[PDB]
């Protein structure tokens, strides 16, 4: 069970293979440009990372 039944097929790619790099949350992630945050964490840190509201 620990290592005998699982790990017998490619399943390393699902949504559970990702999580927000700030809060380990798997919902609403941002993959674009690779900063890998959720919506809200990115909104919090956008000023610091370098994204500024101009449009």
């Amino acid at each position: 069970g620990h290592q005998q039944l699982y790990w017998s097929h490619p399943r390393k790619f699902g949504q559970g293979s990702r999580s927000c790099r700030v809060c380990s949350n798997r919902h609403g992630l941002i993959r674009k440009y690779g900063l890998n945050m959720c919506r809200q964490c990115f909104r919090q840190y956008a000023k610091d990372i370098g994204f500024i509201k101009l449009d």
């Binding site: 941002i30 674009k32 440009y33 919506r39 809200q40 990115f42 909104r43 956008a46 370098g50 994204f51 500024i52 509201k53 101009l54 449009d55």
Partner: protein
């Protein structure tokens, strides 16, 4: 060999222009030829995300833009002066890549 390319990049155009002027003036002060500051197109990273942290409310979005300004400058000079000019304590916020082609 007299083919050297320096790549200047930054999010802030003020620092980019100041460092470009620094490099050009350093090249031209000593007897030496230098090309003009090739001005590459700015890259506008756009990301749009709902303002709200939940599902309630009118659908209002945030359009975060991020401008990357990059220039390329040519140099036909010995590598010693290039290395001296590169280590001139550049202004913060600017990323430089000096390549000896």
């Amino acid at each position: 060999i007299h083919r050297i390319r320096i790549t200047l990049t930054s999010r802030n155009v003020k620092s980019l222009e100041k460092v470009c002027a620094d490099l050009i003036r350093g090249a031209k002060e000593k007897n030496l030829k230098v090309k003009g500051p090739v001005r590459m197109p700015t890259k506008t990273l756009r990301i749009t995300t709902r303002k709200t942290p939940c599902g309630e409310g009118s659908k209002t979005w945030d359009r975060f833009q991020m401008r990357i300004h990059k220039r390329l400058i040519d140099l036909h000079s010995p590598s010693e002066i290039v290395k001296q000019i590169t280590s001139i304590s550049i202004e913060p916020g600017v990323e430089v890549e000096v390549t000896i082609a």
